[PDB]
Write an enzyme that holds these catalytic residues in place. Structure first.
Site, PDB file in Angstrom:
ATOM      1  N   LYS A  85      95.299  48.099 -19.339  1.00  0.00           N
ATOM      2  CA  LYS A  85      96.311  48.937 -20.710  1.00  0.00           C
ATOM      3  C   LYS A  85      98.007  47.848 -20.851  1.00  0.00           C
ATOM      4  O   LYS A  85      98.513  48.428 -21.853  1.00  0.00           O
ATOM      5  CB  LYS A  85      96.961  50.345 -20.883  1.00  0.00           C
ATOM      6  CG  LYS A  85      95.972  51.273 -20.207  1.00  0.00           C
ATOM      7  CD  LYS A  85      95.625  52.630 -21.203  1.00  0.00           C
ATOM      8  N   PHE A 132      95.121  41.287  -8.149  1.00  0.00           N
ATOM      9  CA  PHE A 132      94.742  40.509  -7.069  1.00  0.00           C
ATOM     10  C   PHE A 132      94.619  41.845  -6.043  1.00  0.00           C
ATOM     11  O   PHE A 132      93.761  41.795  -5.439  1.00  0.00           O
ATOM     12  CB  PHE A 132      96.176  39.784  -6.595  1.00  0.00           C
ATOM     13  CG  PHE A 132      96.110  39.700  -5.193  1.00  0.00           C
ATOM     14  CD1 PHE A 132      95.426  39.554  -3.767  1.00  0.00           C
ATOM     15  CD2 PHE A 132      97.774  40.016  -4.685  1.00  0.00           C
ATOM     16  CE1 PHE A 132      95.495  39.196  -2.401  1.00  0.00           C
ATOM     17  CE2 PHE A 132      98.387  39.759  -2.957  1.00  0.00           C
ATOM     18  CZ  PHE A 132      97.121  39.817  -2.374  1.00  0.00           C
ATOM     19  N   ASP A 149      91.197  45.519  -3.031  1.00  0.00           N
ATOM     20  CA  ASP A 149      91.391  46.865  -2.488  1.00  0.00           C
ATOM     21  C   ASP A 149      89.854  47.362  -3.397  1.00  0.00           C
ATOM     22  O   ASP A 149      89.161  48.274  -2.445  1.00  0.00           O
ATOM     23  CB  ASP A 149      91.816  47.800  -3.284  1.00  0.00           C
ATOM     24  CG  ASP A 149      93.384  46.998  -2.927  1.00  0.00           C
ATOM     25  OD1 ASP A 149      93.828  46.762  -1.720  1.00  0.00           O
ATOM     26  OD2 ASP A 149      94.379  47.708  -3.969  1.00  0.00           O
ATOM     27  N   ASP A 185      87.826  49.062  -0.325  1.00  0.00           N
ATOM     28  CA  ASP A 185      86.958  50.699  -0.655  1.00  0.00           C
ATOM     29  C   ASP A 185      85.318  50.873  -0.604  1.00  0.00           C
ATOM     30  O   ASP A 185      85.511  52.204  -1.429  1.00  0.00           O
ATOM     31  CB  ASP A 185      87.623  51.370  -1.840  1.00  0.00           C
ATOM     32  CG  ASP A 185      88.991  51.406  -2.219  1.00  0.00           C
ATOM     33  OD1 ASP A 185      89.956  51.234  -0.577  1.00  0.00           O
ATOM     34  OD2 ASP A 185      90.071  51.716  -2.874  1.00  0.00           O
ATOM     35  N   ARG A 240      85.508  49.456 -11.906  1.00  0.00           N
ATOM     36  CA  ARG A 240      87.090  49.494 -12.144  1.00  0.00           C
ATOM     37  C   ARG A 240      86.876  49.645 -13.373  1.00  0.00           C
ATOM     38  O   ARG A 240      86.591  48.314 -14.560  1.00  0.00           O
ATOM     39  CB  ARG A 240      87.305  48.324 -11.471  1.00  0.00           C
ATOM     40  CG  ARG A 240      88.505  48.143 -11.897  1.00  0.00           C
ATOM     41  CD  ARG A 240      89.840  48.230 -11.671  1.00  0.00           C
ATOM     42  NE  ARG A 240      90.022  48.894  -9.738  1.00  0.00           N
ATOM     43  CZ  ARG A 240      90.923  49.131  -9.318  1.00  0.00           C
ATOM     44  NH1 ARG A 240      91.654  50.206 -10.227  1.00  0.00           N
ATOM     45  NH2 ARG A 240      91.012  49.289  -8.115  1.00  0.00           N
ATOM     46  N   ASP A 296      98.428  53.052   4.538  1.00  0.00           N
ATOM     47  CA  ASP A 296      97.179  54.279   3.576  1.00  0.00           C
ATOM     48  C   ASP A 296      95.644  54.164   4.411  1.00  0.00           C
ATOM     49  O   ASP A 296      95.067  54.910   4.667  1.00  0.00           O
ATOM     50  CB  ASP A 296      96.682  53.921   1.815  1.00  0.00           C
ATOM     51  CG  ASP A 296      96.189  55.309   1.065  1.00  0.00           C
ATOM     52  OD1 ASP A 296      95.956  55.625   1.288  1.00  0.00           O
ATOM     53  OD2 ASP A 296      95.468  53.947   0.212  1.00  0.00           O
ATOM     54  N   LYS A 347     103.308  51.259  -1.488  1.00  0.00           N
ATOM     55  CA  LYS A 347     101.546  50.491  -2.040  1.00  0.00           C
ATOM     56  C   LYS A 347     101.747  51.156  -3.901  1.00  0.00           C
ATOM     57  O   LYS A 347     100.478  50.122  -4.639  1.00  0.00           O
ATOM     58  CB  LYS A 347     100.729  51.656  -1.615  1.00  0.00           C
ATOM     59  CG  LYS A 347      99.334  51.393  -2.627  1.00  0.00           C
ATOM     60  CD  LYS A 347      98.305  51.640  -1.951  1.00  0.00           C
ATOM     61  CE  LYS A 347      96.989  52.303  -2.842  1.00  0.00           C
ATOM     62  NZ  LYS A 347      96.142  51.428  -2.621  1.00  0.00           N
ATOM     63  N   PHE A 405     104.597  58.966 -11.160  1.00  0.00           N
ATOM     64  CA  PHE A 405     103.813  58.676 -11.911  1.00  0.00           C
ATOM     65  C   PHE A 405     102.099  58.879 -10.886  1.00  0.00           C
ATOM     66  O   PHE A 405     101.734  59.159 -11.765  1.00  0.00           O
ATOM     67  CB  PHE A 405     104.056  57.051 -12.060  1.00  0.00           C
ATOM     68  CG  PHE A 405     102.716  56.146 -11.876  1.00  0.00           C
ATOM     69  CD1 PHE A 405     102.656  56.500 -14.004  1.00  0.00           C
ATOM     70  CD2 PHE A 405     101.504  55.848 -11.877  1.00  0.00           C
ATOM     71  CE1 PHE A 405     101.287  56.153 -14.178  1.00  0.00           C
ATOM     72  CE2 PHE A 405     100.543  55.017 -11.952  1.00  0.00           C
ATOM     73  CZ  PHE A 405     100.764  54.914 -13.551  1.00  0.00           C
ATOM     74  N   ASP A 445      98.738  61.156 -11.888  1.00  0.00           N
ATOM     75  CA  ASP A 445      98.497  60.836 -11.580  1.00  0.00           C
ATOM     76  C   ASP A 445      96.723  61.266 -10.444  1.00  0.00           C
ATOM     77  O   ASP A 445      95.592  62.090 -10.840  1.00  0.00           O
ATOM     78  CB  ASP A 445      97.949  59.065 -11.268  1.00  0.00           C
ATOM     79  CG  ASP A 445      97.335  57.928 -12.184  1.00  0.00           C
ATOM     80  OD1 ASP A 445      97.756  57.953 -13.345  1.00  0.00           O
ATOM     81  OD2 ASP A 445      96.314  58.328 -11.301  1.00  0.00           O
ATOM     82  N   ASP A 446      97.146  62.042  -9.504  1.00  0.00           N
ATOM     83  CA  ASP A 446      96.603  62.954  -8.519  1.00  0.00           C
ATOM     84  C   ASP A 446      96.232  63.948  -9.443  1.00  0.00           C
ATOM     85  O   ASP A 446      95.145  64.623  -8.876  1.00  0.00           O
ATOM     86  CB  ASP A 446      97.368  62.975  -7.152  1.00  0.00           C
ATOM     87  CG  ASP A 446      97.253  61.508  -6.602  1.00  0.00           C
ATOM     88  OD1 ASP A 446      97.215  60.896  -6.498  1.00  0.00           O
ATOM     89  OD2 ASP A 446      98.401  61.854  -5.497  1.00  0.00           O
TER      90      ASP A 446
HETATM   91  C1  LIG Z   1     105.543  50.475 -15.620  1.00  0.00           C
HETATM   92  C2  LIG Z   1     104.268  51.887 -15.921  1.00  0.00           C
HETATM   93  C3  LIG Z   1     104.595  51.799 -17.572  1.00  0.00           C
HETATM   94  C4  LIG Z   1     103.509  52.900 -17.830  1.00  0.00           C
HETATM   95  C5  LIG Z   1     102.238  52.560 -16.986  1.00  0.00           C
HETATM   96  C6  LIG Z   1     101.499  53.987 -17.582  1.00  0.00           C
HETATM   97  C7  LIG Z   1     101.202  55.430 -19.333  1.00  0.00           C
HETATM   98  C8  LIG Z   1     100.070  55.045 -19.143  1.00  0.00           C
HETATM   99  C9  LIG Z   1      99.620  56.095 -20.022  1.00  0.00           C
HETATM  100  N1  LIG Z   1     100.133  56.899 -20.868  1.00  0.00           N
HETATM  101  C10 LIG Z   1     100.135  57.463 -22.187  1.00  0.00           C
HETATM  102  C11 LIG Z   1     101.073  59.083 -21.360  1.00  0.00           C
HETATM  103  C12 LIG Z   1     100.661  59.105 -19.872  1.00  0.00           C
HETATM  104  C13 LIG Z   1      98.658  59.908 -20.229  1.00  0.00           C
HETATM  105  C14 LIG Z   1      98.552  60.132 -19.163  1.00  0.00           C
HETATM  106  C15 LIG Z   1      99.110  59.870 -17.396  1.00  0.00           C
HETATM  107  C16 LIG Z   1      99.880  58.835 -18.045  1.00  0.00           C
HETATM  108  C17 LIG Z   1     100.375  58.464 -19.000  1.00  0.00           C
HETATM  109  P1  LIG Z   1     101.263  57.114 -23.145  1.00  0.00           P
HETATM  110  O1  LIG Z   1     102.577  56.366 -23.457  1.00  0.00           O
HETATM  111  O2  LIG Z   1     100.495  55.950 -24.077  1.00  0.00           O
HETATM  112  O3  LIG Z   1     101.480  58.754 -24.520  1.00  0.00           O
HETATM  113  N2  LIG Z   1      98.005  56.410 -20.374  1.00  0.00           N
HETATM  114  C18 LIG Z   1      96.868  56.075 -19.029  1.00  0.00           C
HETATM  115  N3  LIG Z   1      97.401  55.277 -18.109  1.00  0.00           N
HETATM  116  C19 LIG Z   1      99.127  54.789 -18.495  1.00  0.00           C
HETATM  117  S1  LIG Z   1      99.337  53.536 -17.085  1.00  0.00           S
HETATM  118  C20 LIG Z   1     102.226  52.754 -15.834  1.00  0.00           C
HETATM  119  C21 LIG Z   1     103.159  51.886 -15.190  1.00  0.00           C
END
Ligand SMILES: Cc1ccc(-c2cc3c(N[C@@H](Cc4ccccc4)P(=O)(O)O)ncnc3s2)cc1
Ligand SMILES: Cc1ccc(-c2cc3c(N[C@@H](Cc4ccccc4)P(=O)(O)O)ncnc3s2)cc1
Lengths: 336, 336
Positions: free
Chosen positions: A45, A86, A91, A95, A100, A162, A186, A225, A229-230
């Site tokens: 993304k 990297f 990873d 794992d 991915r 980890d 991490k 964050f 995620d978890d």
């Molecule tokens: C520094 C930094 C900033 C943003 C992110 C990410 C954001 C994001 C995302 N965002 C959506 C919201 C969202 C949904 C589900 C989980 C996290 C965030 P959106 O901003 O596109 O509406 N949706 C899915 N993956 C990611 S990864 C990671 C690191």
């Protein structure tokens, strides 16, 4: 939001060109480096790299944003993405992952295998080649080299933590304190501190205290964050997240496990012992069911609310003299 | 020669102490880092690291060799050894080796396995931690960071070239030109250029032309070193070299193979095709026998003589204004 993205992805082509030149018979290796870049650096993304560009623009007075400055910003954003690539390639080997980014893992490709170890090292090296090619004359050069080296070290240390925690894995090890610690080292430092810190140096903001202040906000955002995620991995709508959760049949120090162990009777500890990490879906059903029984969806929703309050407080106390928008734009990407 | 060595090995203890400190719950990871350092950085001959110290002393006027200067020299020598250890640990995984330095390969230890990938990354990172801790206030700091990053990149590129050349391997690929190219990138730059170049920067000698001049001598020495290594692997007295040669039952771009393919009839190409890389000793006997038949021991002895002449000529033309002894001390370590 999303047009800045297309520009970011379009610079990629230039990154690959400059990295993949005067020496004849290393041609074959340079051809391979190109395939490694295209497979591994593309298809995410680009949020981390993009943060560099967005923050840079919010920090720098418009009258010091010539074409060359923006180009350095794009390039450094791509350096964040190369760092990430990297880590992921390495990873996925460690794992034993299959896929991915919906795509077969690089090391799983026929004819790659453990040669991916050197591929990953090359991705790391390309960071410093780009910093040199684009930034060597700039006053923040050394600061960016050091920030990337330090981000790598912190991430590797978190990886070690980890791997010691999840070998025959044991839930005794999975405390709140160790969970926060893995996330900090991490994930949070490279994902949240690094991109803003890079922008900050590029903008001339190099003070230790300002960096420390930004770090405090950003490591906290990183903690939230990863916890979200978890949570989502299991309770997310897979057709919204675009992700099907696998933490359970994999013995992971998930936030859910940590809260579950805190809240469990002896009887419940056993049900977790017996089902966490079997690949049978009856067993995966079981764990989930036990998480609901302890209302972890409610613990999470509460956590998220408290976390939002806390972050806004941190921004209030520690943003200045950076524009609060630098931090708020991130907070909006990760709270819904 | 050998007392300078004991001092070098004795500093190791300090290196490990400074690398393995203020943060509580990363303790476990730091404990693992210590085990990684002690297993992987110890037990070689320390020639590369020691070269840093020896060259430094020959370059610097005695009246700028205070205790702190010597300590930086020891530390940077150890950085060369850490770089080497990064490469070896990773290379042993990629090659599926069993042993190294007469000891089980780190990744082959019970409970390590592919976690060695992160261990290796940590060894790499410790370089930059040490440079920072000991050298950050010095005018050559950035020069040393860049030299180590560049040495890593050159070595990784040489590794890539090596892996493309020996996958189903084919002797068509194993030309003199590709052999020299692998040796230059994968061995010569880090083994021979890096340690002297580091000493040179520490001594204040930073000119590009002087570095280019030293490089010309040192990459040539590196080429000879590896060729002699290949030769000895097979024809060395194993109870002198302390090494039992395995190149043959492993399909390696050895110098011997390159000369053999240059000198072979069609009939002889087939005998090589059939025996190179079988682990049966009748087959390994065969290859050797064919090498003798083409008098590669005589080609080598001739090569070595020509190579000695060439190196002395390079030293004459390109040493100044460095003391010829810097180069001659190396030449003496590798010609007998
Ligand atoms: C520094 C930094 C900033 C943003 C992110 C990410 C954001 C994001 C995302 N965002 C959506 C919201 C969202 C949904 C589900 C989980 C996290 C965030 P959106 O901003 O596109 O509406 N949706 C899915 N993956 C990611 S990864 C990671 C690191
Ligand atoms: C920069 C640099 C300098 C020196 C070396 C090495 C030297 C050397 C060695 N040297 C012996 C001679 C020798 C024997 C066999 C092969 C090469 C050199 P000695 O100098 O101890 O008499 N014996 C065994 N291994 C090595 S590795 C590597 C890199």
């Amino acid at each position: 939001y999303a047009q800045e993205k297309q520009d970011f992805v379009q610079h990629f082509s230039q990154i690959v060109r400059v990295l993949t030149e005067g020496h004849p018979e290393i041609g074959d290796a340079i051809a391979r480096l190109k395939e490694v870049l295209e497979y591994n650096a593309i298809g995410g993304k680009y949020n981390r790299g993009l943060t560099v560009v967005v923050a840079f623009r919010e920090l720098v007075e418009p009258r010091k944003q010539d074409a060359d400055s923006l180009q350095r910003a794009w390039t450094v954003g791509w350096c964040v993405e190369l760092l990430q690539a990297f880590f992921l390639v390495a990873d996925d080997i460690m794992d034993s992952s299959l896929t991915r980014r919906g795509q077969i893992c690089w090391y799983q490709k026929p004819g790659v295998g453990l040669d991916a170890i050197n591929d990953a090292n090359l991705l790391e090296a390309c960071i410093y080649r780009l910093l040199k090619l684009y930034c060597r004359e700039q006053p923040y050069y050394l600061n960016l080299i050091e920030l990337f080296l330090q981000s790598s070290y912190q991430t590797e240390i978190g990886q070690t933590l980890d791997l010691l925690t999840a070998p025959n894995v044991d839930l005794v090890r999975f405390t709140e304190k160790r969970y926060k610690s893995i996330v900090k080292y991490k994930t949070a430092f490279y994902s949240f501190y690094l991109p803003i810190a890079a922008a900050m140096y590029m903008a001339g903001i190099d003070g230790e205290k300002e960096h420390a202040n930004a770090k405090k906000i950003l490591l906290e955002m990183g903690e939230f964050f990863q916890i979200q995620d978890d949570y989502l991995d299991l309770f997310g709508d897979p057709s919204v997240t675009g992700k099907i959760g696998t933490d359970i049949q994999d013995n992971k120090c998930s936030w859910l496990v940590v809260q579950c162990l805190q809240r469990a009777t002896p009887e419940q500890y056993q049900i977790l012992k017996e089902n966490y990490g079997q690949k049978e879906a009856e067993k995966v059903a079981r764990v989930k069911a036990l998480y609901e029984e302890l209302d972890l969806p409610a613990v999470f929703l509460q956590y998220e609310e408290d976390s939002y309050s806390h972050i806004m407080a941190l921004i209030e106390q520690y943003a200045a003299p950076l524009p609060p928008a630098v931090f708020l734009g991130l907070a909006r990407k990760i709270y819904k």
